[PDB]
């Protein structure tokens, strides 16, 4: 019904080509009913730093979000601060001041193609996310076990219904259907 | 982030176990290592801390975490002789350590010395170069002192040492005494005394202006 | 296999410019983030710049605004335009393919020498270091050539056009008080071969399209 979904996009140097990542967003978002009283969406991108592409309450319509999403530019990154990205989506994106609706389910979708440089506090961050009831769906572009394990751990139990594997940027799309319904 | 390796230099014999340490000013999730052989470009050696590149022989191993990382050669080979650099990618700018040079420690070997007087041609130019040659020796530590008409030299001479020989593991050094045609002519004897661990007493090669 | 082949090195005057190119082949160039790394004379390795598969460029502070890293995926060539060169900038530069966000240097170019100095290119003078009683010790004799007062680097030296390699030691060069480079290439041969064997040293300073062969004979 009503969920506040924050998408955490990896935009580090390694991600390529950006267009595939955005197509992934399009397909995913277009299947949704966005609205102040519907599904809300906010997008966060990370690399060396983190930036709030757009807040949870920025757009009141699905096309407004669909259009804003496609306008997102890759900011690159010599590092992959996955930990920072998720923590930022948690401590910031999900605050009432940025459109976090009171008492509404909080859902986070993470997409990345590399071992975070902040492996250390990824444990802590995912932890804080659990304490705050944030459903987490993670996706790993394998374009590998130590990596796959890192990402699955970012997902919520049951790992299997919250984790997605992809061969490369391109195949991301071939998951939006399952991802979409899994988050239902 | 600053990376400082240790030792900076180290001599070891085939079969020895070597362990280079790379310490980082700040903690990092991984460490990388490159192997650079004299006159060639660096080569990926160990990535993601312990992962060996494609060519790296299995005797090589990397390890570490936080602020202390290490490269280890369980059985030093005559081919593993080069200089190794650790590198980090967790902080910007990306940096390398000063590098750690590893040479082949082998039995001492006295150098053969030779001295060469300025050529007829070069002199016909206004400058005179005298070259002393210390050849195929080890250890590397050699000292050359020039003496003109038994007058110790301290002014202008310049040494150059080759890189450890990929065959016999030795070093070759060249000392070049350079003075004006003017000075070279007002003196008789030119000599270079060599001192080396492999020499019971300094060795001297000399000649007098002209000569054959 | 995979590889990067550099070109564009040379001597430039303080404050001038130059442009290195690096030809990639063996992999899907467009996808990787490429970089440039330099090594100063007698120094370690230094990360110069980087450009991602998407066009984000990165730079070491000291070269920021003086260098420009770019790429042309149409012809899988990477580039490093260098302007306002200073002395500190002299080194041998390596293009380099990166792994991940590019911080791990996957593949390397052969390297290319970049020297910046007011010094003017100048062919070397090659004198002989003839074998003699002074160059004799045991059954072996020493002889060689003295490549002098040239600039910039580098000079190549071979013996007898290549047929003489064993016992050859052409030393690394050294900067003279004069700011001119100098080096000697030396060889050791059977004393007995001096009276029947002829020794020639081939020197070649491409930096000034110079090439001289010196016949070295004993007095
Ligand atoms: Mn990445």
How far is A88 from A98, CA to CA, in rounded Å? 12
Chain B residues whose CB is inside 8 A of the C130 CB are 116, 119
CB of C111 less than 8 A from some CB of B: yes
How far is C71 from C68, CA to CA, in rounded Å? 10
Q: Please name the residues between 40 and 79 in chain A that touch chain C, using a CB distance below 8 Å.
A: 47, 74-79
How far is B202 from A62, CA to CA, in rounded Å? 89
A25's CB contacts (< 8 A; 6+ apart) are A7, A9, A43, A69, A70, A72
Which of B29, B48, B93 is the best residue to mutate to test the A interface, defined by the most A CB atoms within 10 Å of its own CB?
Answer: B29
Task: Answer whether B180's CB lies under 8 Å from C177's CB.
Answer: no
Distance to chain B for C61, nearest Cα, Å: 8
Based on the domain organization, do B10 and B83 belong to the same domain?
yes
Q: How far is the CA of A37 from the centre of ligand 1 (A)?
A: 35
Strands C18-25, C3-7: parallel, antiparallel or unpaired by DSSP? antiparallel
For residue A58, what are its two tokens? 């920025």
Q: Which CATH number covers residue B198?
A: 2.60.40.10
How far is C10 from A106, CA to CA, in rounded Å? 59
- Please tell me whether residue B203 adopts helix, strand or coil conformation: strand
- Give the nearest partner residue to A16 out of C31, C58, C103, using CB atoms: C31
Task: Answer whether B108's CB lies under 8 Å from B96's CB.
Answer: no
Residues in C lying within 8 Å of A, measured between beta carbons: 31, 33, 50, 52-54, 56, 58, 98, 100-103
What values do phi and psi take at A171, rounded to 5?
-70, -10
Task: Answer whether C123's CB lies under 8 Å from C148's CB.
Answer: no
Q: Which of B55, B207, B202, B39 is nearest to B131 (CA)?
A: B207
Neighbors of chain B with 3 or more C-beta pairs under 8 Å: A, C
Q: How far is the CA of A9 from the centre of ligand 1 (A)?
A: 11
Based on the domain organization, do B113 and B36 belong to the same domain?
no
CB of B201 less than 8 A from some CB of A: no
- Please tell me whether residue A82 adopts helix, strand or coil conformation: helix
Q: How far is the CA of B48 from the centre of ligand 1 (A)?
A: 14
How far is B1 from C137, CA to CA, in rounded Å? 54
Kindly list the distances between the CA atom of residue C82 and the CA atoms of A55, C34, C127, C153, in Å, as whole numbers in the listed order.
42, 17, 37, 19
Task: Answer whether A113's CB lies under 8 Å from A10's CB.
Answer: yes
CB of B195 less than 8 A from some CB of C: no
**Domain endpoint, select from B49, B81, B106:** B106
For residue B143, what are its two tokens? 């000292």
- Please tell me whether residue A63 adopts helix, strand or coil conformation: helix
Chain A residues whose CB is inside 8 A of the B94 CB are 78
Give me the count of residues in chain C.
219
Q: After which residues is chain A broken (C to N over 2.5 A)?
A: 143
Cis peptide before A54 (omega within 30 of 0): no
If residue B143 lies in a helix (H) or strand (E), which one and from where to where? strand B142-148
Q: Which of B130, B146, B128, B117 is nearest to B183 (CA)?
A: B128
For residue C76, what are its two tokens? 């899988």
Cβ pair C94:B41 closer than 8 A: yes
- With vertex at residue C114, the alpha carbon angle to CA C95 and CA C207, rounded to the nearest 5 degrees, is 120
Strands B9-12, B100-104: parallel, antiparallel or unpaired by DSSP? parallel
**Radius of gyration in angstroms for the set of CA atoms belonging to chain B, rounded to a whole number:** 23
Q: Which CATH number covers residue A47?
A: 3.40.50.410
With tokens 């961050």, the residue in question is A125
- Count Cβ atoms within 10 A of the Cβ of residue A133 and give its class: 0-12 exposed, 13-18 middle, 19 or more buried: exposed
Count CB pairs under 8 A between chains A and C.
42
What values do phi and psi take at A122, rounded to 5?
-70, -30
- Give the nearest partner residue to A16 out of C50, C53, C103, using CB atoms: C53
Count CB pairs under 8 A between chains B and C.
133
CB of A13 less than 8 A from some CB of C: yes
How far is C91 from C111, CA to CA, in rounded Å? 10
Based on the domain organization, do B66 and B138 belong to the same domain?
no
DSSP B61: E
Q: How far is the CA of A46 from the centre of ligand 1 (A)?
A: 9
How far is B197 from B169, CA to CA, in rounded Å? 16
If residue A149 lies in a helix (H) or strand (E), which one and from where to where? helix A145-152
Range of the domain at A20: 1-184
CB of B129 less than 8 A from some CB of C: yes
- Which residue of chain A is at minimal alpha-carbon distance from C56? A76
Strands A163-166, A134-141: parallel, antiparallel or unpaired by DSSP? parallel
Q: What DSSP line would sit under A28-46, residue for residue? A: HHHTS-BSTTSBEEEEEEE
Distance to chain B for C178, nearest Cα, Å: 12
Chain C residues whose CB is inside 8 A of the A12 CB are 101
Kindly list the distances between the CA atom of residue C146 and the CA atoms of B119, B128, B191, C128, in Å, as whole numbers in the listed order.
10, 12, 18, 6
Q: How many CB atoms lie within 10 A of CB B198?
A: 15
Tell me, rounded to whole angstroms, the distance of Cα C67 from its chain centroid. Answer: 21
Cβ pair B29:A118 closer than 8 A: yes
What values do phi and psi take at B167, rounded to 5?
-110, -75
- Give the nearest partner residue to A119 out of B29, B89, B92, using CB atoms: B29
**H helix runs in chain B, sequence order:** 120-123, 181-185
Secondary-structure breakdown of chain B: helix, strand, coil percentages, each rounded to the nearest 5: 5, 50, 45
Q: Which of C88, C210, C113 is nearest to C157 (CA)?
A: C210
Tell me, rounded to whole angstroms, the distance of Cα B103 from its chain centroid. Answer: 8
Long-range pairs of B42-47 with CB within 8 A, sequence gap ≥ 24: B42/B85, B42/C37, B42/C45, B42/C94, B42/C105, B42/C108, B43/C108, B44/C104, B44/C105, B44/C106, B44/C107, B44/C108, B45/B71, B45/B84, B46/B71, B47/C99, B47/C104
Neighbors of chain C with 3 or more C-beta pairs under 8 Å: A, B
Cβ pair A14:C33 closer than 8 A: yes
DSSP B97: -
For residue B85, what are its two tokens? 């650099």
Fold for domain C119-218?
Immunoglobulin-like (2.60.40)
How far is B193 from B177, CA to CA, in rounded Å? 13
Task: Answer whether A182's CB lies under 8 Å from A136's CB.
Answer: no
What values do phi and psi take at C27, rounded to 5?
-155, 170
How far is C185 from C157, CA to CA, in rounded Å? 7
Based on the domain organization, do B111 and B101 belong to the same domain?
no
- Which residue of chain C is at minimal alpha-carbon distance from B173? C171
Note the CATH architecture for domain C1-118.
Sandwich (2.60)
How far is C168 from C183, CA to CA, in rounded Å? 14
The interaxial angle of helices A18-30 and A62-70, nearest 10 deg, is 180
- Count Cβ atoms within 10 A of the Cβ of residue B141 and give its class: 0-12 exposed, 13-18 middle, 19 or more buried: exposed
If residue A147 lies in a helix (H) or strand (E), which one and from where to where? helix A145-152
How far is C127 from C30, CA to CA, in rounded Å? 51
For residue B25, what are its two tokens? 């000013």
Neighbors of chain A with 3 or more C-beta pairs under 8 Å: B, C
Distance to chain B for C84, nearest Cα, Å: 21
With tokens 């050539």, the residue in question is C145
Rounded (10°) CA dihedral B73, B77, B83, B84:
-20
Which of C27, C48, C54, C103 is the best residue to mutate to test the A interface, defined by the most A CB atoms within 10 Å of its own CB?
Answer: C54
Distance from the first to the final alpha carbon of chain A = 9
Which of B31, B51, B94, B184 is the best residue to mutate to test the C interface, defined by the most C CB atoms within 10 Å of its own CB?
Answer: B94
Q: Please name the residues between 67 and 86 in chain A that touch chain B, using a CB distance below 8 Å.
A: 78-79
If residue B152 lies in a helix (H) or strand (E), which one and from where to where? strand B151-152
Task: Answer whether B204's CB lies under 8 Å from B195's CB.
Answer: no
Q: What residues pair up with B109 in beta bridges, in sequence order?
A: B138
Task: Answer whether C178's CB lies under 8 Å from C124's CB.
Answer: no
Kindly list the distances between the CA atom of residue C170 and the CA atoms of B20, C43, C155, in Å, as whole numbers in the listed order.
31, 22, 10
How far is B44 from C101, CA to CA, in rounded Å? 16
How far is A106 from B48, CA to CA, in rounded Å? 35
Based on the domain organization, do B119 and B52 belong to the same domain?
no
How far is A114 from A10, CA to CA, in rounded Å? 9
Experimental method: X-ray
Give me the count of residues in chain A.
184
Range of the domain at B181: 107-209
**Domain endpoint, select from B82, B106, B130:** B106
Cβ pair B29:A78 closer than 8 A: no
DSSP A159: G
Q: Which of B122, B36, B131 is nearest to B85 (CA)?
A: B36
Rounded (10°) CA dihedral B44, B48, B51, B56:
10
The reported resolution of this PDB entry, expressed in Å, is: 2.8
Cα atoms in the Cβ-side hemisphere of radius 13 Å centred on A110: 36
Q: What DSSP line would sit under chain C, residue for residue? A: --EEEEE--EEE-TT--EEEEEEEESS-GGGSPEEEEEE-TT--EEEEEEE-TTS-EEE-GGGBTTEEEEEETTTTEEEEEE-S--GGG-EEEEEEEEETTTTEEEEEB--EEEEE-SPPPBPPEEEEE---STTEETTEEEEEEEEEEEBSS--EEEEGGGTB-TTEEEPPPEE-TTS-EEEEEEEEEEGGGGTT--EEEEEEEGGGTEEEEEEE---
């Amino acid at each position: 019904t009503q969920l506040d979904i924050v998408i955490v996009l990896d935009g580090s140097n390694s991600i390529y080509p950006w267009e595939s990542v955005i197509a992934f967003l399009n397909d995913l978002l277009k299947r949704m009913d966005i609205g102040p009283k519907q599904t809300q969406v906010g997008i966060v991108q990370y690399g060396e730093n983190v930036t709030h592409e757009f807040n949870l309450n920025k757009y009141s319509s699905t096309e407004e979000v669909l259009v804003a999403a496609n306008k997102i530019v890759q900011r690159g990154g010599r590092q992959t601060m996955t930990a920072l990205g998720i923590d930022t989506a948690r401590k910031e994106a999900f605050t009432e001041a940025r459109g976090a609706r009171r008492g509404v389910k909080k859902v986070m979708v993470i997409v990345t193609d590399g071992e975070s440089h902040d492996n250390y506090r990824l444990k802590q961050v995912i932890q804080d996310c659990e304490d705050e009831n944030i459903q987490r769906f993670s996706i790993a572009i394998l374009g590998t076990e130590k990596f796959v394990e890192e990402i699955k751990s970012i997902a919520s139990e049951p790992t299997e219904k919250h984790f997605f594997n992809v061969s490369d940027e391109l195949a991301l799309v071939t998951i939006v259907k399952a991802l979409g319904e899994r988050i239902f | 982030i600053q990376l400082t390796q240790s030792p900076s230099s180290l001599s070891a014999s085939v079969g020895d176990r070597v362990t280079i340490t790379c310490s980082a000013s700040s903690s990092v999730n991984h460490m990388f290592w490159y192997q650079q052989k004299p006159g060639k470009a660096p080569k990926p050696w160990i990535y993601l801390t312990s992962n060996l590149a494609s060519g790296v022989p299995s005797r090589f191993s990397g390890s570490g975490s936080g602020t202390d990382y290490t490269l280890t050669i369980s059985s030093l080979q005559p081919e593993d002789f080069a200089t190794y650099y650790c590198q980090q990618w967790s902080g910007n700018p990306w940096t390398f350590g000063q590098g750690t040079k590893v040479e082949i420690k082998r039995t001492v070997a006295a150098p053969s010395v030779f001295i060469f007087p300025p050529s007829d041609e070069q002199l016909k130019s206004g400058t005179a170069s005298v070259v002393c040659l210390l050849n195929n020796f080890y250890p590397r530590e050699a000292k050359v002192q020039w003496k003109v008409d038994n007058a110790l030299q301290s002014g202008n001479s310049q040494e150059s040492v080759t890189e450890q020989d990929s065959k016999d593991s030795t070093y070759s050094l060249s000392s070049t005494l350079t003075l004006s045609k003017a000075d070279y002519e007002k003196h008789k004897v030119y000599a270079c005394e060599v001192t080396h661990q492999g020499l019971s007493s300094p060795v001297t090669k000399s000649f007098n202006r002209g000569e054959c | 296999e995979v590889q990067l082949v550099e070109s564009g090195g040379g001597l430039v005057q303080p404050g001038g410019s130059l442009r290195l190119s690096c030809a990639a082949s063996g992999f899907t160039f467009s996808r990787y983030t490429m970089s440039w790394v330099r090594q100063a004379p007698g120094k370690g390795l230094e990360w110069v710049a980087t450009i991602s598969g998407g066009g984000h460029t990165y730079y070491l502070d000291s070269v920021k605004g003086r260098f420009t890293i770019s790429r042309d995926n149409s012809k899988n060539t990477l580039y490093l335009q260098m302007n306002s060169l200073r002395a500190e900038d002299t080194a041998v530069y390596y293009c380099t393919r990166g792994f991940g966000d590019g911080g791990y240097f996957d593949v390397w170019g052969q390297g290319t020498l970049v020297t910046v100095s007011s010094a003017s290119t100048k062919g070397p003078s090659v004198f002989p270091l003839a074998p003699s009683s002074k160059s004799t010790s045991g059954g072996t004799a020493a002889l060689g050539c003295l490549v002098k007062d040239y600039f910039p680097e580098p000079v190549t030296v071979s013996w007898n056009s290549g047929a003489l390699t064993s016992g050859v030691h052409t030393f690394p060069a050294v900067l003279q008080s004069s700011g001119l480079y100098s080096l000697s290439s030396v060889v050791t041969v059977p004393s007995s071969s001096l009276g029947t064997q002829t020794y020639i040293c081939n020197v070649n300073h491409k930096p000034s399209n110079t090439k001289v062969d010196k016949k070295v004979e004993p007095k």
